[PDB]
Amino acid sequence: ALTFAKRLKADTTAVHDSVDNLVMSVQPFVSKENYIKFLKLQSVFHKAVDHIYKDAELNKAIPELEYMARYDAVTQDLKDLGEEPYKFDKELPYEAGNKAIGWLYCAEGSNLGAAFLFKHAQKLDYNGEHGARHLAPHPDGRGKHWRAFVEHLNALNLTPEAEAEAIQGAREAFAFYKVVLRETFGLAADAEAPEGMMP
Numbered sequence: 741a742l743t744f745a746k747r748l749k750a751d752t753t754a755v756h757d758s759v760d761n762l763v764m765s766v767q768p769f770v771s772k773e774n775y776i777k778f779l780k781l782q783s784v785f786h787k788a789v790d791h792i793y794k795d796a797e798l799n800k801a802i803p804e805l806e807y808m809a810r811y812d813a814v815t816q817d818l819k820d821l822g823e824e825p826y827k828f829d830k831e832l833p834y835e836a837g838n839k840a841i842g843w844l845y846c847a848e849g850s851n852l853g854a855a856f857l858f859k860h861a862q863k864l865d866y867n868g869e870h871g872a873r874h875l876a877p878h879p880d881g882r883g884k885h886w887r888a889f890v891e892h893l894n895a896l897n898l899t900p901e902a903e904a905e906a907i908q909g910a911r912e913a914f915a916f917y918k919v920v921l922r923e924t925f926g927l928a929a930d931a932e933a934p935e936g937m938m939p
């Protein structure tokens with residue numbers, strides 16, 4: 741692939757689809773109880789990247805980055821559902837450097853692709869003002885926002901060597917998402933969606 745952002749996508753599409761499949765297999769919308777499990781999982785992931793969204797160096801390369809964070813929104817969704825802020829039971833990742841750029845790609849891309857989840861949350865009467873605030877589209881549009889973000893990512897002009905570390909970071913962010921999902925939904929370590937399932 742000819743660009744950093746495209747290489748990130750290429751190298752992480754298989755694991756991304758494993759995440760999509762696993763999230764859907766545990767039935768996040770089957771009940772309020774399961775949706776709360778989903779919100780807990782989302783809380784941990786978005787907390788884990790909070791310090792990256794606020795990173796001073798990255799905010800100088802990517803204007804207004806700190807404001808793209810969704811942790812506050814997920815935490816308000818929890819409140820809406822009658823829950824207090826959720827705290828992970830285990831130590832949370834606090835990644836840095838090139839690898840942290842990969843975590844940032846993973847988190848920011850998750851908003852890009854949150855339309856399907858937002859659609860299904862709406863069936864439960866949860867919308868951008870109550871219960872599904874964290875899934876609502878960027879006010880400028882999901883795509884407009886992502887393409888801009890994508891420009892800034894490519895413009896970091898990471899050397900190929902630093903790109904490798906960033907891509908490894910993205911692999912690790914996806915893997916952590918599934919570790920959290922499993923602990924949260926009561927699955928075994930390394931549990932996956934039924935084999936052969938397609939997003």
Ligand code: HEM
Pocket residue numbers: 745748749756759760761763764845846847848849850851852853854856857883913914917939
């Ligand atoms: C069942 C849940 C999920 C579904 C159905 C889903 C679906 C999608 C879709 C359709 C896109 C393409 C959107 C577009 O191009 O307009 C996308 C992109 C992406 N998603 Fe997901 N996703 C889910 C969960 C996640 C999660 C939990 C993460 C991160 C932890 C994530 C990370 C990403 C990233 C980083 C991209 C950008 C790919 C790119 O580089 O173009 N997704 N997703």
